[PDB]
Amino acid sequence: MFRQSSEEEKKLYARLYESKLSFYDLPPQGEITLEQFEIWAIDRLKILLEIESCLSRNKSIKEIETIIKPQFQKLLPFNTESLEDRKKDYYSHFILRLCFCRSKELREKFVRAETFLFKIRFNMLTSTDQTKFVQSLDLQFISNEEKAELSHQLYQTVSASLQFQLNLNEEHQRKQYFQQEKFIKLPFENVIELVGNRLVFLKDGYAYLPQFQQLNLLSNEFASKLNQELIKTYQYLPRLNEDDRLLPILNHLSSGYT
């Protein structure tokens, strides 16, 4: 049969937003303006302020999504090819690190708001984008034999969840989906919130988690790594103090949360 046969910064951000979401993993490079610094930080701050306001009002995920999604196109665009939007998102997050690393209360509030925004944006993805984003983060499925041996217990665990979360009222549909569903084994301490609600099957200190659940692990890893980075960002705040022109902006940004 017949057969034939700075740029680096732009490539870096194209790589970082190929998945459409990021753990905000790497040091930015090059330059932006100070007006851009202030405005981008304030835009992300406004979105996170509304997220914290809705959570203090005890609104659900669907209501918060209805409230926040129109604001991305104005303040912080998502699901976009634009280099400007991608840099805006990345730099705004990194600025609010320096604003909110200063104290435990600020770190907790920033981690909570940013993790909830991470959850919202993850919900906006297609399943293919979610799979690719999870795989890019380098994030144990059980064998078919182990699934067969534990099939009764796993099905008893997930059958109600399949009906209520995936709307599979028919038992026939639930059985077919369960036949097609994969499960993850890990220590029970890692998914303890699902353990307290009895949403996972426990055996010998290991929790058995279906594939259609487990986003709390992703968001918890995001929150934990963000907290560790904020603790690190706190430790080298004395290097931030070499430029006086940034401190009034950060004080202004933090004043809205105090």
């Binding site: 040091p27 930015p28 490079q29 090059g30 330059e31 932006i32 303006t33 100070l34 610094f37 730099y91 690190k232 960002t233 430790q235 080298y236 290097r239 430029d243 940034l246």
Partner: protein, 198 residues
């Protein structure tokens, strides 16, 4: 921060008429007793001379370059109120006062902040959106003797700004030429992330 607060200490732009030599303050597309902005451009009210784009842009550039040269004249002032010495001499310590016995700190009389705010004030005068929104620094107060009697309507200001968009953009490009070379502007992330270089 409003333009009124930001540009409180800036020097007002003065334009000299090419025909009758009368100097007047320029405050963008606003009512004035000395000039009128028509559909054809800037016109002097004293002699009805219409300014060409070059005549306006050269005067703007001359004012910018005068401010830059004043900045690089390098006048220093001691911040101690008792000493208050003004000199262009720079010690090898820079901030040490040259008067014997004085512990005050020498600072530039015309700082880079003042120059940058001056250049932005020039840039603001030729921003079309600020002219439409009437957000510019006022060149007259209501109690001033030269306060114009007839005020331009908001619709008239928007129409004149649309009609003169090319001229305003040209003057703003002349200002932006120098603002892009001002060192006070940008923030380098590559050097800033030295902790990842730990």
């Amino acid at each position: 921060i409003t333009d009124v607060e930001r540009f409180k200490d800036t020097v007002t732009l003065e334009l000299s008429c090419p025909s009758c030599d009368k100097r007047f303050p320029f405050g963008g597309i606003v009512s004035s007793n000395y000039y009128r902005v028509s559909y054809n451009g800037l016109q002097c009210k004293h002699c009805e001379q219409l300014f060409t784009p070059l005549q306006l842009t050269s005067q703007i550039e001359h004012s910018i370059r005068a401010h830059i040269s004043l900045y690089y004249a390098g006048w220093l002032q001691c911040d101690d109120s008792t000493c208050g010495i003004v000199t262009r001499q720079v010690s090898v310590f820079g901030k040490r006062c040259l008067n014997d016995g004085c512990t005050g700190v020498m600072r530039y009389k015309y700082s880079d902040k003042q120059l940058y705010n001056q250049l932005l004030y020039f840039d603001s005068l030729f921003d079309c959106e600020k002219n439409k929104k009437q957000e510019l620094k006022p060149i007259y107060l209501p109690d001033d003797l030269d306060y114009p009697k007839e005020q331009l309507t908001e619709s008239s200001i928007k129409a004149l700004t649309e009609q003169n968009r090319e001229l305003m953009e040209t003057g703003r490009s002349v200002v932006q030429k120098y603002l892009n070379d001002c060192g006070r502007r940008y923030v380098d992330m590559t050097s800033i992330f030295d902790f990842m270089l730990n």
